[PDB]
Amino acid sequence: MAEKQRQLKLQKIYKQKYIGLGDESTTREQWQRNVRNDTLNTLQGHSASLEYVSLSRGDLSIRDTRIHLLKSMSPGYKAYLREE
Amino acid sequence: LNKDEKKERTLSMLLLKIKNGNTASRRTSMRILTDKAVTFGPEMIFNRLLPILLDRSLEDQERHLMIKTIDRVLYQLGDLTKPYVHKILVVAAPLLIDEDPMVRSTGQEIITNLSTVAGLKTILTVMRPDIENEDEYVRNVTSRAAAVVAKALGVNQLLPFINAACHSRKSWKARHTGIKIVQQIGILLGIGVLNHLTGLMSCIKDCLMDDHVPVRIVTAHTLSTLAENSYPYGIEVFNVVLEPLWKGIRSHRGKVLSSFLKAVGSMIPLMDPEYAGYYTTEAMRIIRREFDSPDDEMKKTILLVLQKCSAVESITPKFLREEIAPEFFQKFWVRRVALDRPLNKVVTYTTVTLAKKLGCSYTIDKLLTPLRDEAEPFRTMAVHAVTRTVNLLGTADLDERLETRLIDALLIAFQEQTNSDSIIFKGFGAVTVSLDIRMKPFLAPIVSTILNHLKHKTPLVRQHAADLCAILIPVIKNCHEFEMLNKLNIILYESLGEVYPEVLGSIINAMYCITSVMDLDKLQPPINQILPTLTPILRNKHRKVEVNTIKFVGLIGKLAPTYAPPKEWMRICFELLELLKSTNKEIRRSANATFGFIAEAIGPHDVLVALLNNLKVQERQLRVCTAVAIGIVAKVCGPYNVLPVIMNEYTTPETNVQNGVLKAMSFMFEYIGNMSKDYIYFITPLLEDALTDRDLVHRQTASNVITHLALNCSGTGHEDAFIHLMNLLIPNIFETSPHAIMRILEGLEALSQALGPGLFMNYIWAGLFHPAKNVRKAFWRVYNNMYVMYQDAMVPFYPVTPDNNEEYIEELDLVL
Amino acid sequence: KPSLSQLKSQVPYPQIIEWYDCDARYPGLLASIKCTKNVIPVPSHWQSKKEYLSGRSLLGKRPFELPDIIKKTNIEQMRSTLPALDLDYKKLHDVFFKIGANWKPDHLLCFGDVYYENRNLFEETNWKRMVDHKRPGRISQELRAIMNLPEGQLPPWCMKMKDIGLPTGYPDLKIAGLNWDITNLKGDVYGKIIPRNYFGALISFETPEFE
Amino acid sequence: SRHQFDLIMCLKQPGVQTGLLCEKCDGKCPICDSYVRPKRKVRVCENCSFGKQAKNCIICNLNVGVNDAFYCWECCRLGKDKDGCPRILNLGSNRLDRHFEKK
Amino acid sequence: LSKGENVPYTFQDEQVRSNPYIYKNHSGKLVCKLCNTMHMSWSSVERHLGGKKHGLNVLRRGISIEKSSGSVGLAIQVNYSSEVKENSVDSDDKAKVPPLIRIVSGLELSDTKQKGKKFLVIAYEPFENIAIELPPNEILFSENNDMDNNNDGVDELNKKCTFWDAISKLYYVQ
């Protein structure tokens, strides 16, 4: 009882720090987003993996791939490209 | 009725067992409430429970058992109506003023729980009729209660409430108490007041101007608390209030002068160097004028300002010595000061702060008149100022004359002390450490008085005679008076059959200080004649003797193992193994450390058989404290010596041995940190039987071996023994019990580092969704522990394909 | 709530999906994860109210047997656990380092093997030990006594093998008196099957020395 | 605390100041409560600093502190090091209940 | 509380036990091997052996065993007490029940060593059971001796060929 209700309290504190921590009832929609935002963060973050993506895209400057990856963290970046 | 009249008894029976009941009774009736609190009507609980707390009969033991039930009930239900929120605060809030802090906190623990339960809107409705109340005590209570609410919910939500009360022209008293709410907001929030300081300042300034003096005074204190709690940062918000203070200082005198100066005194350190020099030299005029004020309220304010000013750059240390200092020591060091404690703490602290600006040699110069004074309680005050100063000051400043006069003052003030206190020893010991090589000439007569006081009848004086040897030893070795060292040592040896345990403990302590410093060969008794005199002392019960002895015996195990013959070390290993029944901890901890010192000396195998024969014993401390010692014997003498003897002992069919052999293996794998790799492969079959076994405690202790064994053997390349060890754990994921399941999660978190997140997550993706809400609930704990350790390390491994999710990321399929 | 027949069509390994997977909040996803390349199924003792470990297997579990390498150290005799030591420190160190350097437990477990409640590894370990030792063309003394088949005599299925042929599954089996000289019928044998450096070869092997 | 379940840690962003431990709680990791093999100094947040509170042990928060508090090696490998301020706020059920029974 | 018995460990490879079910596992706990219960103490066990669940599992095992296992004839004359000890028990508790015989296969014994022959067991409440080995596959196994009268008593064997002189306490069997 006293322990189990500590457990709740840390769940809400870890979720604030480290963002995506599922609990139990987590929408597939909800979980997927967190998998998408860590991949985008890692692809941009390591300077190897930013090159490798930049060259493969044929994007003009490494910097533009980096913003392509961060705007993708938004849901309305798919729509925004389509309206161009 | 007759059915539901039964619940009406059960609660009244439970509430009876809790309040008055056997310790094994109430412990079962608390378990029943915390589970069943929901099904019983909160009306029935509170209406029955709360009236008890209003009788005049209940004892403090009985009251805190009732409050602990309110706190455990409020934690669950979570939706509570207003009639009881008024009742609960009638009971809970008067705790906040109670004498001792243990009660003060458990009262505060309620209101911060109630604040979330009952929500923001409800409580603030219950305070409004209460703050306008006429009664004083009720207002003093809910200043402290509404402030506790403020921290829990955040002050901004509660701020317009205060602003309504403080700025209220309706009632005078709402202004007053609305301002006290600002203190206990500023006191609770501590430094964090700050960002809220602007909103709070709405209340203080305008509420300051009130024609009622008792309001005028309160704000002057609520500023000094906001000023201090803020510290360096605030000033920009306190300029608005700085003007009306002075016109209040330059006139009102009385007790309004005591409060305004406290405010202005505590704004100074947060002023700029430009102003801070100005206002103090302004204020230092006022203090000089108020030195003669017999009031207490003013003296507490005069000390605050003297205390604050020295820090400010503008005043020079010359100005102090020329004026402020001589008019200080003569007025504030009167013997009437030393008597009352609340104003002693201030004067010494004020003296100590002035000692920075003042040359150290200046303050110590002025403290010689009180150190030589006739009154006892006044010599003790002037010692605290030197000792406190002494750590604070370096003794390099003192000319030779004060260095001689200081030590004569202390010896005297040492040898008339009545009450037992640490202050004289630390003080007389912070002086010696500073000037140590210079101490040589003064060290002859001091040691004569130690030898004179060890013959004295009153047992306190034989404590302080021996307590002051333990301090001088590190001084003496620098001095080189080794013969004295051997003179003190023998004299401490012949006294070592004393009666009083308080005194006998401290003699051993001085024996321990002489022994470590001195040449091992030299000691007079010598060592081989000393140690057999200690072994019968280990059986002395008490504690001061057990602790100080165990540290002395273990010292010899380090420094001179070869003296007592090994059958004597075995006589000690039994006397210690009986001694860790003790209730103290530091005993049990030092007793285990000295098995390492003996195992190094004589041998591990003679000692282990003594320990493993002791795991059969029932009582838990004995089995855990043997399990530690086997861990310690392993580290010191090597695990290869210990481990096959422990793996054999595991076969015995008694269960308590089989945990004690698994617990011993936990300890020994954290003490040999990195080693551990050589030994795996041997223990995988021993942890094979444990995680397979039926009873839930083996599956707990072996998984507590895996946590130690995985962390520090990771990256070694075992890794096929950790998949084995994993294959056995994961089926324990569904296990309940609290001690079992956290030990298993720790194992799974640690095995993540042996395997890696990818190879480990293969077990966990599957049931992370799952239909079962329970299987699902258990895997998500494990996943959450993994996600914290690895966020970017999981990203390659997610089980995600372009069709399996909508968006995916198209840049993961790009190939250059 | 899609019927499992609908749900087993999506999946490359339809034999995993079960009646209950249909009821998941997001079956389409669970079915795809569950059938993903390396994921291992959740332990099966959920839905069992038994509490994972309950008796029937556990009543008969044997107490513990020290690994053979350790048993060489003689401790089994010095301290009799069922139902002072004069141990030698150089000997003990070598057991863990020099002699038992590479020793690894006999079976261990593999990547996907979870431990289900009724499984017993003590059988499985012997069955590996059995297959490697037992063989076609040789019969142990113990079995010979049971069969009443003295050394040097062809087994009783000899006549039928002459009629019907050699074992369908042992094309390279030679049997004395059939397709191997009868003088090879000797002792416990009557037949026989008769048909690097890995870049990192260490080329020297040196354990850490105690002295 | 590892064994006493009611106590609530702080878990805020650590500042620059070091936690302290009393003689009794000395040599303990504030997370796992192990006496062995320290690694890193603890660092507590501002709002656990300020006045009288800063001096008290960061475990019992009752007795006054003297030595620094370190994280053990094992809690620095797992990373529980850098969660946050490792300071216990409430005094807990065990400490109170001893207190009242004695008197 | 154990009445001095050695309750054996579960691994010891069986001194007839007082009962025979209770053991001790690889740990020290006590266990019923029928009921698969774990017990803390001898006091607990005596509660179980006196319980209603340990009653049932004996009956279930009872059934489970009871479902599987011009010539010359033999005659046995079994004599019983001469009102020596039967003077303390006369409360019409099966006192009217005569001795009973059954043919048992040696395939099941407390020791389970050798077997392969039958026994003509004879039992009476107070006295101890008695057996007689029957190597011959069949002797005196008659063919419709009487004219098919149906009072099964216990079985065809008992009514067919037994006599109980209850007045003299002599049980004849042939």
UniProtKB/Swiss-Prot annotation, chain A:
The keyword Transit peptide does not apply. Pfam families: SF3b10 (PF07189). One of its GO terms (cellular component) is spliceosomal complex. GO terms for biological process: mRNA splicing, via spliceosome; spliceosomal complex assembly; U2-type prespliceosome assembly. Signal peptide: none annotated. Belongs to the SF3b complex composed of CUS1, HSH49, HSH155, RCP1, RDS3 and RSE1. Involved in pre-mRNA splicing. Required for the SF3b integrity and prespliceosome assembly. This is RDS3 complex subunit 10.
UniProtKB/Swiss-Prot annotation, chain B:
One of its GO terms (cellular component) is Prp19 complex. GO terms for molecular function: mRNA binding. One of its GO terms (biological process) is U2-type prespliceosome assembly. Signal peptide: none annotated. It comes from the Eukaryota. Keywords: mRNA processing, mRNA splicing, Nucleus, Repeat, Spliceosome. Coiled coil: none annotated. Belongs to the CWC complex (or CEF1-associated complex), a spliceosome sub-complex reminiscent of a late-stage spliceosome composed of the U2, U5 and U6 snRNAs and at least BUD13, BUD31, BRR2, CDC40, CEF1, CLF1, CUS1, CWC2, CWC15, CWC21, CWC22, CWC23, CWC24, CWC25, CWC27, ECM2, HSH155, IST3, ISY1, LEA1, MSL1, NTC20, PRP8, PRP9, PRP11, PRP19, PRP21, PRP22, PRP45, PRP46, SLU7, SMB1, SMD1, SMD2, SMD3, SMX2, SMX3, SNT309, SNU114, SPP2, SYF1, SYF2, RSE1 and YJU2. Interacts with RDS3. Contacts pre-mRNA on both sides of the branch site early in spliceosome assembly. Belongs to the SF3B1 family. Present with 521 molecules/cell in log phase SD medium. This is U2 snRNP component HSH155. It comes from Saccharomyces cerevisiae (strain ATCC 204508 / S288c). The lineage of its organism: Eukaryota, Fungi, Dikarya, Ascomycota, Saccharomycotina. The chain holds residues 156 to 971 of 971 of the full protein.
From Swiss-Prot, chain C:
Its main location: nucleus. GO terms for molecular function: RNA binding. Keywords: mRNA processing, Nucleus, Phosphoprotein, RNA-binding. Coiled coil: none annotated. Transmembrane segments: none annotated. The keyword ATP-binding does not apply. One of its GO terms (cellular component) is catalytic step 2 spliceosome. It is found in: Nucleus. Essential splicing protein required for U2 snRNP binding to pre-mRNA during spliceosome assembly. To mammalian SAP 145. Some, to C.elegans ZK632.11. Present with 1830 molecules/cell in log phase SD medium. This is Cold sensitive U2 snRNA suppressor 1. It comes from Saccharomyces cerevisiae (strain ATCC 204508 / S288c).
Curated annotation (Swiss-Prot), chain D:
One of its GO terms (cellular component) is spliceosomal complex. Keywords: mRNA processing, mRNA splicing, Nucleus, Spliceosome. It holds the Pfam family PHF5. Its main location: nucleus. It comes from Saccharomyces cerevisiae (strain ATCC 204508 / S288c) (Baker's yeast). It comes from the Eukaryota. PANTHER family: PHD FINGER-LIKE DOMAIN-CONTAINING PROTEIN 5A. The lineage of its organism: Eukaryota, Fungi, Dikarya, Ascomycota, Saccharomycotina. InterPro entries: PHF5. Component of the spliceosome where it interacts with CUS1, HSH49, HSH155, IST3 and RSE1. Also interacts with YRA1. Belongs to the PHF5 family. Required for pre-mRNA splicing. Involved in regulation of drug sensitivity and may play a role in multidrug resistance. One of its GO terms (biological process) is response to xenobiotic stimulus. It is found in: Nucleus. The keyword Phosphoprotein does not apply. The gene is RDS3. This is Pre-mRNA-splicing factor RDS3.
